[PDB]
Amino acid sequence: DKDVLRDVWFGRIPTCFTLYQDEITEREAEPYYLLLPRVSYLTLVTDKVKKHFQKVMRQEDISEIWFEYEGTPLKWHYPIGLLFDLLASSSALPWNITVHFKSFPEKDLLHCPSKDAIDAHFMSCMKEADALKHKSQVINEMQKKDHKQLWMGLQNDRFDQFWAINRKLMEYPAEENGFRYIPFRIYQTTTERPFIQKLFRPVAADGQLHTLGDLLKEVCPSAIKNQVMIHGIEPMLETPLQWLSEHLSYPDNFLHISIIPQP
Amino acid sequence: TDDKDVLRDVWFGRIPTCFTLYQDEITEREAEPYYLLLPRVSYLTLVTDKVKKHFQKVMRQEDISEIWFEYEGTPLKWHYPIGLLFDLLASSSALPWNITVHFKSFPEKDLLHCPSKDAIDAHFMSCMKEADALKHKSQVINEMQKKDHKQLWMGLQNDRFDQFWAINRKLMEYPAEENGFRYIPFRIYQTTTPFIQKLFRPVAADGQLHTLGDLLKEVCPSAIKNQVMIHGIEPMLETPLQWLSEHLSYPDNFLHISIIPQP
Amino acid sequence: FPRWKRHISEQLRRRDRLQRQAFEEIILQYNKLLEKSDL
Amino acid sequence: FPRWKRHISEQLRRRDRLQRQAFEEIILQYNKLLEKSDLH
């Protein structure tokens, strides 16, 4: 199973960053091509983009940077993979993202905080995830130095360094035979619509393990015409939920599941 | 000129291709790979003049040797159209198509030489003349003036769709009473570059139109888990063969049909 | 129109999407940079 | 290896052929050329 973790982690998304046309440039501006980590956040991967376009604009021209796809702004705290699966799966590669330096929508999009604060959203997501899995038991026993290693493991794309700590977060007491609750979030047609996150257990009353279909039957019976997409694949609805929470989660220990129609 | 929409999407079919110079080749300077979109219907030797020149600069003024192309150890036989080569050799692999460019060690007994563009012109006409011999007992290709033959060539070489089908529409026409070509020009390729070609008529004594399935049942009975590929698509077996020879042939009026496995 | 003609012409558009539309834009920019890199 | 696990592992490789392997090498090559222009 360790092979799945590695190809989930090292997943990529070819992306084309084109400067929004409205923007004025001293000299001509090239698109920046790049492979974004599905598990990372737009917050981390874009100083290389900000720096690329830094050259062609005077200080007066430059403002806070933000990203759009097809008119809709991109949330800084949704994982890059999840954003793509939900919003751009049907379109043609590479992922065409528009880069702005003007007209930030203060009404519809959170600000890009210090890189410090995406780290905040990451750790709160892990904390919430751990609360469902363990009654918050494990992440409260880690040294602070471990929280910054989880973060810097995600940040520097070092797999084994990250999963050095994260493995403990995936373990459970033998008698329980699975997590208490599974940390998951379901997304429907757009980012703006509120995601679903309820309580649900990976082991039944009988002792048999619950599947993906059980989660969907219980939490979202509209996915049973529709496509269920996790990290760019459609796992069989007969897939045990506990295994999915263990292997197909994003680094924030959550199962970001997309519901999208065909084709 | 029946369903021009299908004809144009076939004619303008492209294949993303990566050309890398072989490592053992003596260079005066490092040579970046040449990226290109190759026309599926043209010939490898006809459309690579820009690639050849790119590597001429890096290499010494000696050698000054004929250029050849290799795809993972196998020399590419330029008599086969670019689309057929890709479909047959590299389609199941990942884009772009990775072609190695050589200049030294020409495989004299494995690959035919291509000395002039005139020689390509020669091969092309032999293929059409063979095609028409099957369709109309050589009646149409012979009754056209030589100014029409050199127009078909100049149409393929210079990628002008209208100029080509100005002449080719006659070759796709048949006597109304026969309701089909005399014989259908086709070649079926196995995994290696020895093809199969017998005689086959588009209409039976029943009067019914023969399909692609009827053809394979009588000519290549080892398909049906094989996939049948023509211009990169897998048409329904129920597809009438006469319509295929009219619309899914290459400019040499042949149905180059590749038989590949799945995945 | 008939079943097969629709089905055939669909994949031609699907094929061009998968094979041409994806690389057309990047390959064009790659070549433009390549020529510009010959000073 | 049971049905779902095999099938999941295949898509992950299928996904990498289509999304990553297709663009990694050309994007790489594109950037090396770009530095040469920035530094004219």
Residue numbers in the entry:
A (entry chain C): 4 to 227, 235 to 273
B (entry chain A): 2 to 194, 197 to 227, 235 to 273
C (entry chain B): 10 to 48
D (entry chain D): 10 to 49
Sentences from the paper on this structure:
Whole exome sequencing identified a homozygous missense mutation, hg19 chr6:106,727,648 T>A, corresponding to E122D in ATG5 as the only damaging mutation within the genetically identified chromosomal linkage interval. Crystal structure of the resulting ATG12–ATG5-ATG16L1 complex indicated that E122 is located in the vicinity of the ATG12–ATG5 interaction surface; hence, we predicted that the mutation in ATG5 could affect the conjugation of ATG12. We could detect the ATG12–ATG5 complex when both wild-type proteins were co-expressed, but we could only detect a minimal amount of the ATG12–ATG5E122D complex. Interestingly, expression levels of ATG5WT and ATG5E122D monomers were comparable to each other, indicating that the mutation affects the conjugation process, rather than the stability of proteins. To confirm that the mutation does not overtly alter the structure of ATG5 or binding to ATG16L1, we analyzed formation of the noncovalent ATG5-ATG16L1 complex using constructs containing a TEV protease site. Both wild-type and mutant ATG5 protein were efficiently co-precipitated with ATG16L1. Indeed, the co-crystal structure of a human ATG5E122D-ATG16L1 complex superimposes well with the previously determined structure of the WT proteins, with the major obvious difference being replacement of the side-chain. Although the overall structure of the E122D mutant ATG5 superimposes well with the wild-type protein, the mutation causes a striking decrease in the level of ATG12–ATG5 conjugate that is formed when the C terminus of ATG12 is covalently linked to Lys130 of ATG5. We speculate that the E122D mutation causes subtle changes in the conformational dynamics that propagate to Lys130, which is less than 10 Å away, resulting in less ATG12–ATG5, which in turn leads to reduced LC3/Atg8 conjugation. Our results indicate that E122D is a partial loss-of-function allele that impairs but does not completely abolish ATG5 activity.
